[model samples]
Target: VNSFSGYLKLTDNVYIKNADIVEEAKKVKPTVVVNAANVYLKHGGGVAGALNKATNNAMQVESDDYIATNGPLKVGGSCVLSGHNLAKHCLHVVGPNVNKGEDIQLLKSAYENFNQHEVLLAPLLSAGIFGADPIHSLRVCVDTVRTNVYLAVFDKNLYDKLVSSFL
Candidate 1:
C-alpha cells in the first residue's frame, strides 16, 4: 500500500519480522508466496493501509494466515535487498544477484526468445522485472556489485562454493 492517503490505516510502510521471514523462505522454498514489491505500503495509503487496518481493527485479521488472505502476497525473491541472504549484491543485478529471485541466464536468453521459456540463471538471490531494457539492467547491476569484490568480507565456505562452480 502507498503512503496511506486512501485505504485503511493498516496500509502503510511498516516493517515486520514476518516480511523478512517470507523473504528468507523464498530463498529456500515457499508454500505460500507473495511478491511484496507489488504492495504499496509506503506512507500515502495503499494495500499497506489495509494490511494495517486488518491487523489493528477487530474482526479483521489476527494472525499471519489471516493477513495472507486479504493481503497481496508479494512473494518470490524480488527484493533489491534481503534481510535474509548471506550475499550482499546477490539480488542487486539482473542475473542471479541482479534480481530478487529472477535468473540472469534468462536475461541472456531474452535476446532471441522474445516470448518463451528460457534457461533460468541459478542465482544465490533475487532480481527485478523482465523485458528488453529491463533485462539489461541486470548486467549493470552485476558490474556495480562486482566492483566491491575486493572488500575482503568472508563467509565460512561461500568463496569455495561459488568459485568452485566456475571450475
Candidate 2:
C-alpha cells in the first residue's frame, strides 16, 4: 500500500494534496489544468513553467501566440486552449502578483471560471513565484468551486507548512 504525505479537504469535493504535480498530471490526465501566468503567457516559472515544460513548451508557444495577437488579459481574465489530450485542456489565468498588490479578488474569480469543467487540476496558483500565500490562494479556489478539484503541491515542505493551518 502507498500513503500520501499530506491531504486536506477544503470543501465537499475540493482537496489539497502534497504530491508531484507532474505525476498527478500523468496519473489523473485531468480534464482541465489551470496555469498561473501573466497576460502574455511567457512561462517564466512556477505553475506556468512547470506546465509548459511538461507539455514540451507547446503550451507556452500557443498561449503566447494568442496573447500576442489578442489584447492583454484583464484581472480575472482567462484563456483556454486545447491540450490535445496532454491533459485535455489548459486554462491560462491572469493571476495576482503579490509584489504589486494585485487584486486577490481576481484570483478568486479566475478560479471560478475553471469550474465549467469537471476534474480540474491546478497548482497553488499564485502562491509560488508571485509570492502570495498558499492559504489565501487555496481559500479563494475552494470558496469558488462547488465540485471536485485536485490541487497539487510540488514541494512537500511547503505543503506541510501550509496544510498545517487546517490542522
Candidate 3:
C-alpha cells in the first residue's frame, strides 16, 4: 500500500511527513533541522542520538561545546548550531519533561521557537523519554508552528495516530 513516505498538509504551511527524519531532512534541505534536546543539550539518546549518528557525531561534539560555553538550555529554549552534513543549521530545543508536571505550554514554547526559521523538520518532541502522549504532542506541533514545517514521524503507529486525527 502507499504509506510510510508521503506528507499530509494540516494547514497551508504545516505538514506531517511519514518518513525518517534524517533522510527527509536531507531531501528537503530545510533551513534547520530540529533536535529534541535535553536541557544540557546532550545528543545521546532517541532522536538526538540518531541525528548525532547520522552526522558522524559532530552534533554531539558541538552540543558539548555549546553547553560548556552557554550553560544548560532551559526547557522550551532553543539554540541554533551547525547542522554538519544534515542541513544548514540545527535548532536544538529542550522540551519539557511531562513526568515532572510540566504542562503543554512548555512544549508549545519549543515549537514557537521555530518562528525564526523559514523551513524546518522536527520530530514529535516530549513524546519519547520525556513522557508526553503522542497525540497531544502532534496537536501541539500542528497548532503552534506558523512557518513551513515538516513533522517527520518515523513510527508507523504514531504516524497513523496523527493521520487518523485529521482524516
- Which numbered prediction scores highest in lDDT against the true structure? 3
Q: Tens-digit lDDT track for model 3 on 19-122?
A: 88888877766668999888887788888988999999989998899889889988899999998888889999888878777766798898889888877788
lDDT of 1 by residue, 43-94 (tens): 1222222323432432122223433654432332122222122222112122
Q: Total backbone clashes of model 2?
A: 0
lDDT of 1: 0.25
**Model 2 Cα lDDT, one tens digit per residue, 1-167:** 11223457766867788877666766767777777778777887877777788888888778767877896787677888866445778777777787777876678877776677766777776787787888887778777877677788888898887677753
Give Cα distance to truth, residue 121, candidate 2, Å: 0.7
The per-model lDDT (C-alpha) reads: 0.25, 0.74, 0.82
How much is 47 displaced in model 1, in angstroms?
Answer: 16
* Number of the candidate with higher TM-score, 1 or 3: 3
Q: Each model's TM-score?
A: 0.19, 0.86, 0.90
Q: Which numbered prediction scores highest in TM-score against the true structure? A: 3
Residue 70 displacement in candidate 1 (angstroms): 24
